[PDB]
Structures are given as structure tokens and as C-alpha cells.
Symmetry: D2
Subunit: 264 residues, 4 copies
């Protein structure tokens, strides 16, 4: 059985994770770390619901000594992850961190402390197992098919192109793929931009339409063939089998692992 506490239960990711943890047969949600803005009207922004089973704490120190969870799932913000991770790792709690955060120096302090205490920690910048396998498998495939393109498609409210997942995908592929540009050397755009963006010579195209959520295809060309990997995320439940896997696996490892590609 794994007793889980969640930091940031009211967030978009947090509300899904609450549901996932409560519904996983071998997990029990035992506490949350939460606090609202001082200006939040309860009418607009309700409190996390009061229960005996899931008390709400405002600070992690207090949660840990009272509840002694097995696992802390941190769905807070990049400014808070280092102090939370260090606190867990000194108190025999396995932290599972969903974040874009940590400095180099901060991550090295966490890594060393997890190692000496023989305590697991997983830092997952992308919990969605389909996305992570897409990227992991693309990087293995690029040893055999060095000509590749990435097409990513999102809703039309998204502010950044290309997506973070496409940039990460291109970085992973570029660890394996020899650096080169693609397309005939003499090709020329007659409408500026037709060929897309380039990362290390890898073309990346960004589609933005109503109706779409989050989608990526990776297209590997070679003589006489096409090999394609695709991930479609229709909602934030897409991230939950990575949350589940991370909570299960953190219990079994004795060091810090950064990125789910390193343990799937």
C-alpha cells in the first residue's frame, strides 16, 4: 500500500491526480498541501473539500510529521520544488515532482542526498507515458532513419510555437541523429515559412486549430518507407498513467531519476 500526499490539489493537474490516487487500488490519499490567494472568494474558488481522511496542510513540514506519507507528489510551482524535495529526502518521504524546475546546483544537491539516504525521487517534466515513449522510441529509431520531421498540433489559444514537447523531442533525437539539414540543397520557399522551423536540421511544424487539444507526430523517412510515431492527448487524464507509474516506481528505486524516459 502506498500512502500519498499531494501538493497543489486544486490545480489542473492536481485535480486529476487526486482522482487517480483515490481510484488506484494500492494507493491511499492521506493529505494535501494547499493554500489559496488571500483575495480568492470562496464563491469563485472553493476550498479543497474538508474530510477526515484527507486533511489539508499549509506547510509541508507539518504535513510530514503528522501524516508521515510514503510519497509526496508535488504539483505546485517551480519556485517551491527544491525546498520541498530536500525536506522530503531528509524525512524518509519519496518525492515525485511534476515540474519544469530545478537549477543545476539544486538538482545536484537533491541527487546526492537521495543517493546517500538510499531513497527514491522521480522528477518528471512530462508525466504522459505516450508522449514520453514517443520521444524515447524516436531517439532509438533515429539511429536507423536519420531523416525525420516533427508535426505538432494544438488548440488555437496556445501562445508558443513550437511546443515544449516538440523542442524536447527534437533535443532527444539530436542526441542520436547526426547533425544535418534535410530537403534538396537547392530547394527554395516561394511562400516564406513553408518548410517550418529547424532544430539541428530537424524540421518542426506547428498547427493551431480550434477543436485540437495536444497532438504530435514524428515522421521518419527512408527509401521506400515511412515510419511514424504519434501521440494524441484529449484531456489531462493523459498524464495520469505516468503519475501512477512514478508513485509505484519511486518506492522501488534508491536514487533520483530525472525524466521518465530513464525508467520506462
Amino acid at each position: 500500500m502506498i500512502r500519498v500526499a499531494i501538493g497543489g490539489p486544486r490545480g489542473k493537474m492536481g485535480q486529476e491526480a487526486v482522482h487517480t490516487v483515490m481510484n488506484n487500488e494500492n494507493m491511499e490519499l492521506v493529505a494535501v498541501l494547499d493554500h489559496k490567494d488571500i483575495g480568492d472568494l470562496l464563491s469563485e474558488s472553493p476550498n479543497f473539500p474538508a474530510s477526515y481522511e484527507v486533511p489539508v496542510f499549509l506547510n509541508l513540514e507539518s504535513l510530514i510529521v503528522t501524516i508521515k506519507p510514503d510519497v509526496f507528489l508535488d504539483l505546485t510551482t517551480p519556485h517551491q520544488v527544491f525546498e520541498h524535495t530536500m525536506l522530503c529526502l531528509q524525512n524518509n518521504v519519496r518525492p515525485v515532482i511534476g515540474t519544469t524546475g530545478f537549477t543545476d546546483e539544486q538538482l545536484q544537491q537533491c541527487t546526492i542526498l537521495a543517493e546517500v539516504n538510499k531513497l527514491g525521487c522521480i522528477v518528471a517534466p512530462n508525466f504522459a507515458i505516450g508522449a514520453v515513449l514517443m520521444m524515447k522510441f524516436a531517439s532509438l529509431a533515429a539511429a536507423y532513419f536519420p531523416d525525420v520531421e516533427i508535426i505538432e498540433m494544438h488548440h488555437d489559444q496556445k501562445l508558443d510555437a513550437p511546443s515544449g514537447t516538440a523542442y524536447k523531442t527534437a533535443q532527444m533525437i539530436a542526441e542520436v541523429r547526426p547533425s544535418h539539414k534535410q530537403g534538396h540543397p537547392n530547394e527554395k520557399e516561394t511562400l516564406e515559412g513553408a518548410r517550418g522551423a529547424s532544430y539541428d536540421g530537424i524540421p518542426i511544424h506547428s498547427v493551431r486549430l480550434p477543436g485540437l487539444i495536444a497532438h504530435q507526430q514524428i515522421l521518419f523517412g527512408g527509401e521506400g518507407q515511412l515510419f511514424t510515431l504519434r501521440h494524441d492527448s484529449y484531456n489531462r487524464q493523459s498524464f495520469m498513467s505516468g503519475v501512477t507509474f512514478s508513485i509505484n516506481q519511486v518506492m522501488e528505486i534508491k536514487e533520483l531519476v530525472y525524466g521518465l524516459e530513464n525508467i520506462l
Copy 2:
């Protein structure tokens, strides 16, 4: 029965058309208009094969008076189509023209002459019925889904991006779709080119990989849905059901029609 003569039988399109006409139950190939470069070694560049059934002519005047074909399928070059079309239309031969050619003034002379002689003429810049239906249907769909993107994919020897078919597709859609840009007004590329090219606000993306031949997808977004039209051409047989349809239909019309979208 329709007695067909072919201009340019040794060309990439011509060799397919020869096969198609010979194998269509209701057509007979009765002559070809052909000539080689004065420097063509027969070892490299064979003559069209000699037969009693399919004589070879060097000029169209001579073909027409000797053979009196029902239909002339012109697979020659843009510099020759006007004189060929005029000659047919004055000699009771229905011309079917595969070309990017004609000036405005030339096409108006052909149109008027076909009309007065009550003789059909089809000019087809794209014979592939799947491509033409893709475009025709996209232009009807754009009345209901004004947010659309085009993704075109070709082999990596292609020199121009975007493809002619994508440009034509975008022009057809823009006849119906109100002019607007797409994507959040505040979106910004962090890798130049990610959002593609724009035609009248329609994004167009160009993929260039080994293995691919010629492919296009048109993606129509709206709330809660995606509607997609796609054409894949694996070889030049893709153009042959348009060749067949044009030869059949030219016999039945009494005026010049430019573009297969206007008669499918």
C-alpha cells in the same frame, strides 16, 4: 468507341496515358504525335515502338487529316498547347490538354472557337481525381469550417515549397473562406518558421522526406471536432482516372471547360 491520339507518348505522364488508353475497353489508341531531340542516342532514348496500329506523326496537321481522331490528348509542353488546341478545334477533334499553359488571350480564343463549333475541350492542370476532389470538397467545407490548415508532403528531391497543388488548394479555399489569420493574436514563434507559410491567412506546411511521393492533408478545425481530407499519390497512375474521365466527358460537352473541378 473513342479513337484517341496522344501527344508526347514518351513523357512520364505520356507513358502512363498510352497504357491507360490501350487498356480502356471503349478507347483505341490510333496515333501519336512525337519527336526526339536531334542528339538522342537510340541506345539511351528509344523511339516510340513501331506498329501498324499506332503510327507516329511529327506534326499534328498531318496526324489529324490521316487518322481523324475523335480526341487528341496533349501531354506536350506549354509552348505548344495553344496552336495544338486551335488546330483540333477547327478540325472537329476534341482536345484534352494536360498543361500549366495558355495565356488569358489564348484561352479566350480557344473558348470562343469551341463554343461556336459546339465542340468539347477540357484543359486539366491536374488530372488526379483524388486531388481535384480534395480541393473541390475543401472549398465547399470552408463555408462551414473557416479555420483550416494545409500540410503537403513530398519526396526530398522537390525544389519548390509549397507545392503547386497546395497553392491551388489555398486559392480555391480562399474563394469561399473569409480572409482571416489564425492562431492566438499574441502567439510568437520561438524557432523561426514553426507556424509555416500563410496564403490569405491559411497556414501551409511542407514536409520533404525520402520515401514519400506526393501527399496532402487539409485539416478543418471547429469546436469539438476535426474534419480532414487527404490525398496520397504513390505513382503516376494516380492521374489516369482523370485522363479516362476527361476523354469520356469531352465527347459529351459542347464548350471548353478549364479545370476538372468544374465537371466532376
Copy 3:
């Protein structure tokens, strides 16, 4: 301006339609026809919310005389549509019916009455414009590509295979496509069922997975090419541009139209 009343506002389709009508600039939601089961606890099943702008009626007679809506959008049940449609058509209200209902005889009474009163009526068994265009366009395409397959994909709670939309698609195509079977005459299944179901010789395949919502692809083969039409519905907002179109168009027609393919 079009003053709209909705029958069945708490239904899955109804709740979306309420939102759509309230948010369309040229429509005003002026009333609902609604009633709950006598055993519905308000705690489980709330009343439609009380407002001055949108009164709730238990019977349509009463709604019509008090509110005199321009359009009645019926999202009730097959047992109620005939009496509702007849009542509208005698009271100068344009009915827009979302239903699998009507008998032959019932529909003929509605058709005749709409015609004599010069009043529009639309009956839409499928409001999703992308789905309906998919089917309409497939039926036009089947004149040129008689070899076709349908692949439909839904969530894994769905009880019927194939879907109603696939059956309707196959019926529409079969109006145009000559009846024939496909696949080599000597082909044999070594694992029973591999080739799918057949409707008039058209193969139909049904995919059932978690994660999927409602999806269909129609694949048209021919020499050297593939032409594909696809619709993806991610949520019930997919049906709302047909609801909007129907309410707009019913005002402009003077007879009953059955199926949106007949007016898009």
C-alpha cells in the same frame, strides 16, 4: 434575431445546445420545455435554473401561446417528436428536430403540413456538420472511386458495432456505388473476422478503445492513389455548428427537409 425555445435542456445534447443558443449573437433563448422524473432527488438531478429570461414549461402548447418562439429545437425523445412537430407547424413555429424518430406516415403528415403553411422544418438525425459532410462527400466520391472501406473508432463502452454513423455512411455510398464485393475473389481469412463486416460489399471495421471518443475514416482506393475523408469528434460541441446552421436555415426555407446532407 431568432427567438429559440429548447426542448430537453438538461440532456447531454440539450446542455450543449443551451450554451450554443445563448452564445450565438443572433439568437435568444426564450424558454425551455422540461420536466423531471417524479423520483429525481434535486440533490442528484437539479432543476433547470430559474430565470426571468428563460421560463420553464411542462407542455409545448403552453410554451407556444405564452412565448411565441420563432424556432423550437426538439432534443426530447422519439416518442414525442411527431406531436411536437405537428403542434409547431400549426402554430407558426419552425421546428428543428434532433431525432432518430418518425414513422413514414408521421413524417408524411409533417411534410404536407409544412408545405401548405409555407413553414420550414428541419429533421436532423446527425447535427455534426463534419460527419454529415464526410458522408455527403463520400457519396459524391464513390462515383469515381467505387472501392471503399469504412473504419470507425469509438470508446470501449459502446455497445453496438458498427456505429449508426457507419451504417448511414455505407447506405449513402451505396446509393451511388455499384454493388460489388472487394478483395481478391480467392482471399481467405485465417483468423475469422479479419476482413470486417460488409454492407452491400463495403467493408466496415469497428475499433473500441479507451481514450477514443467518436471517429470515422472513409478510405477510397484506386490505381496509384488513396483518397481519405475523416471526422474526429472529441466532445458534444461537435454537434453544435449543425444546431446553429439548422436554426438559421429553418427560417429561410418553406418546406420540411429531412437530413442535413440535403441542405449543406
Copy 4:
């Protein structure tokens, strides 16, 4: 440099392999093993072309002693592979076998002999790297997404459904995926066959159309997401990067490897 001899150079696979070996910078085609049917008119069925560089042998014993190739690529028939493989392995030639062949007992004799002689042998029932990676990656993915479907699409002259590649894919997945059926327990087909074939509960669907060559998609469902692997083969050049990889890698291994999934 690797000196390669090819068995069966005039076969569909053989003619591609001849080209591939001749064009690979580090390979030299040094001989072929070939013979025609006694009834083959040279007019219909030409001899492999005569050259000093690539002599033609009728038996492998004779080829091996005269030419002493590094690698023998066997593109012959299942009845001949065992005797060819044994002969190579006793004569310091690395055999690379493209076949559906070998008995259990035959393969064990080859395995043992390769091991004692510290000589590489690769037996590849599927040379296409995209196909093999598709299958290998699907089997890894099935540890995280146990609900999966296979859709395979081929030309309409194919006699068997499902394809061998789909059957192999399903067998590979079933090594990892817990055995279960999919779809609602109460689902019912209203048109027989809609749900496809089942292998260990894995649904398999077979599409047969003109225009298609050889295609497979593997669809992995889970909450809120879809993860898809796809391979498209447009021609027999699709198999050639596996031929190249096998010839390179056989030189580096010291035992027999059956199936490219075991060394990619």
C-alpha cells in the same frame, strides 16, 4: 570492406538487394548463386547479366571455394536455407538468411555450429527496419497500454488476411500484454465481423484496396490518450536498410541471431 555473394539475384527481393549491395560504399558484390528453370525462354526470363566482377555459380560449394566471400545473403527458398547455412558456417562465411524457413532441429544445428566457430549468422524473416521497430516498440509499449488494436492495409490482390506481419506483431505484443478481451462485455455486432479478428484478445482488422501496398498501424488506447505506431512500405526498397544492417552486423557478432528485433 565486406565482400558479399547473393543467392537468388533475379527474385523480387534479390534484384533490390543486388542494387543495394552494389551501391553501399563498404560492400562489393563478388558473386551470385543462381539458376533458371529448364523451360525459361531467355526472351521472357533473361539470365543474370554476365560480368567479370560478378560471376554466376550454380552451386554454393563452388562459389565459396572460388570467391571466399565474407557474407552470403540467401534470398532463395525455404527448402534450401538449411543446407546453405550449414555450408557457410563450416567454411568461414557469415550467412544472412531472408526466409520464413528452418525447422526447430535445423535451426538448433545452425545455432550450435555458429557458436562453436565464433561466426555470426543472422536469420531475418522481416528485413524492413520500420516494420521490425514497429513491432519491437509495440511490445515495449504494451507494458503500459494493455488495450491495443492492429489495422493492416494491403493491395487488393493479397490472398491472406490477416497479414503475416500482423500475426507476428500480435504474437510479439502477447509476450508482454496480459491476456484479455477488449470492448464492452455486452457489445454485440449487428453486422457480422465488424469487430475484426482476435489474437489473444487483440483485435486485428484487414483493409484491401487498389492503390495500397503494405501498411500497418498499431493503436494503443488509455485514459485520455492514443499512442500509435505506423509503418508504410511503398516498394521493396523498404527492406533494404535491414539487408544493409544485417550484412554490417553479421561481421561483428559471433553467434546466430534469429529476428532483427533481437539486434536493432
